[PDB]
């Protein structure tokens, strides 16, 4: 059977031996990468693309750098190469990906996480709340999902404040502090990056909004790597993490290889061709009337070993198994819930201190 | 010995590269440069976006640039905005008028010496108050740009009112169903926001439905009186042209003067850190990047070549000047100017679709 070249890019420390466990067959190449700046990522993927006929990329990293997703989307869109953000900063949710993107992520959408957050609140009857976001993309999608959910519900929801903080400017005028001081709600939903949340919490503490009587609920990208807990994160912080526990990295890489291979097999089986992988990033301008996004109809609908590995048109996982986590007094993230097939199951009936 | 502070630029040609080098030299000449001294680092546009992003790293971020000037070539400023944005290095757009660059989520450290197309609503609104057009019809393309003009005009109106807003799919050739809706309405002042090729479709459909003659007013922007849009444009139309909008030489001159002033104001403060030296291995932002943005955002340069330079809440140029253009006997005739805040009519009489309303 024909062979499709698949590059598996691993950033940081990982067990390559553990990781190493249709019409078309994959020729997998595990690639190690030390740096995650734009030049390093662009250069690595472009060098690999010229050395081998690379049909698709499986990317995994150990960082909390949500910018990796953005760098990858840009590469994916410019070169018309499927790229899967399966772990780390590469799987940190990228709202409004390019039209020409073939970038897909293992993780929940902003809208699904916002939904899970409200499911947690309904459980403990936390109907009075406020929202805080930065300009980080997806903030509009977050506020909108909350608003539309709350609007179309026979529940006593009360959204007291919605704050938008400008993290692109310095805080010499203490605008954030003056904005945060307006918060009165016992529950605060925060949408921003992990680096942004460290600052926000430092300030919110100075104004005394982090203690008991103030509960902060945050998305997956804020908690990020559960083994990296910024000192400024408040005790009793609730987050909606993607299951780094049960859905381990060797399984993700396997699934990522299956998606690219199945998609390729499916397109070859239906059109008697698959797109010829570009040998250059440096020719993308002249050779684009000959390139398409066509493989996306297939990459979005892959089922493997009775597991629906399908993605949304927006490039996020369709049915993830989410974990509800709580930052305890020993400053470690503790599992306190599970999100299944649109069902929430918590550990506690009475939320503890 | 002073501290050498680099300024970057992505310009059209070697002529423009030389103009930038001269503007930095003049900045060093006019300012007190015992403490800090500017150095021009520049390149021309690369053939594609990946190549451009790599050039920003290799050629400019490698030189610890404090800001990057960007023009449109002879391929957009986006890979530059993204690369510089990663580090929070400010980008100064010299000629891009697309409203998308006003979006802080996407274009994080971006300012421009030219306003977005959507800001033409500021001129239409002043034109509306002047000629007493209290009831208007707004026709916009259903793209970002079209919606940006509609939001901006709506903001100003909320006196004169937009009786209805009509949106069309970009690329539609038959707009007779859309224009039939507008014809039924009492209002006879039609404002258009469309690209060059989409405006052509409007004009052709409008003319067939006999809406380009006496009784109607057509108030349009720059894009809708350019290239092909002009071939089929009705006589009597009122459009706009941003004075010096395409003069890369004038915008380099003004952007350098603004940046030079802001650098010196920045070094009056304490704990000013240097930008990263190159991209490789550097994933943290420039800690002074956000402070430098705030200093730039609030910079005023009154004696600019392109007028009074000030930036708004999105870092878009304020006090921009426009030529009020009128199509008379198939010729664009300047009938007035929008000086930055006021309409000044010249001695050339306006000819409306047909005669004088
Ligand atoms: C775009 O076009 C506008 C409109 O003309 C210009 O704005 C005017 O600029 C002039 C010149 O700077 C200003 O004139 C000064 O007005 C003072 C009084 O102003 C009041 O009254 C006027 C008229 O009702 C109002 O518009 C205004 O709001 C005030 O309430 C006078 O006291 C000044 O005279 C003194 O200074 C001049 C020099 O400036 C001397 O020659 C005199 O001898 C005297 O000492 C002067 O006439 C005017 O106020 C501005 N008008 C508005 C509406 O703001 C913009 O300058 C122009 N922009 C560009 C980029 O060119
Ligand atoms: C502007 C921010 C991001 O949108 C954001 C972060 C925090 C916010 O508060 C708001 C927005 N991005 C832009 C793209 C950068 C990566 C990159 C580099 C080179 C090529 C393509 C892409 C990473 C930083
Ligand atoms: C990455 O770092 C390790 C450190 O042990 C080194 O062995 C490896 O060669 C480096 N990567 C590259 C591309 O040189
Ligand atoms: C997804 O996959 C199955 C594979 O058998 C296919 O038949 C089905 O039509 C696809 N679904 C959609 C909605 O495209
Ligand atoms: C462009 O601007 C410069 C001012 O820096 C000026 O010398 C030149 O004549 C202008 N050109 C046009 C076409 O207006
Ligand atoms: Na801006």
Residue numbers in the entry:
A (entry chain B): 32 to 52, 62 to 393
B (entry chain A): 23 to 96, 102 to 185, 209 to 407
Share the article's original sentences.
N-methyl-d-aspartate receptors (NMDARs) are ionotropic glutamate receptors widely expressed in the central nervous system that mediate excitatory postsynaptic signaling. NMDARs are heterotetramers usually associating two GluN1 and two GluN2 subunits. The NTDs endow NMDARs with a unique capacity for allosteric modulation, harboring several binding sites for small molecule ligands that act as subunit-specific allosteric modulators of ion channel activity. Crystal structures recently established the existence of a "phenylethanolamine binding site" at a dimer interface between GluN1 and GluN2B NTDs.
We solved a cocrystal structure of the NTD heterodimer complex with ifenprodil at a 2.8-Å resolution, and then, using a back-soaking protocol, determined the structures of the complexes with MK-22 and EVT-101 at a 3.0- and 2.8-Å resolution, respectively. Ifenprodil binds at the heteromeric interface between the two domains and interacts with residues from the upper lobe of the GluN1 NTD and from both the upper and lower lobes of GluN2B NTD. The narrow elongated binding site is occupied by the ligand in an extended conformation. One end of this site, which nestles the benzylpiperidine moiety of the ifenprodil molecule, is buried in the hydrophobic interface of the upper lobes of the GluN1 and GluN2B NTDs, capped by F114, I82 (GluN2B), and A75, P106 (GluN1). Thus, the distal hydroxyl group of the phenol moiety interacts with E236 from the lower lobe of GluN2B, whereas the aromatic ring interacts with a cluster of hydrophobic residues, including GluN1-L135, GluN2B-F176, and GluN2B-P177. In contrast, the GluN1-L135 side chain engages multiple atomic contacts with the ifenprodil molecule, but points away from EVT-101. In particular, mutation GluN1-L135W was found to be highly specific for ifenprodil, decreasing sensitivity to this ligand but not to EVT-101 (5.9-fold versus 0.7-fold change in IC50, respectively). We believe these results indicate that the incorporation of a bulky histidine or tryptophan disrupts ifenprodil binding because of steric clashes.
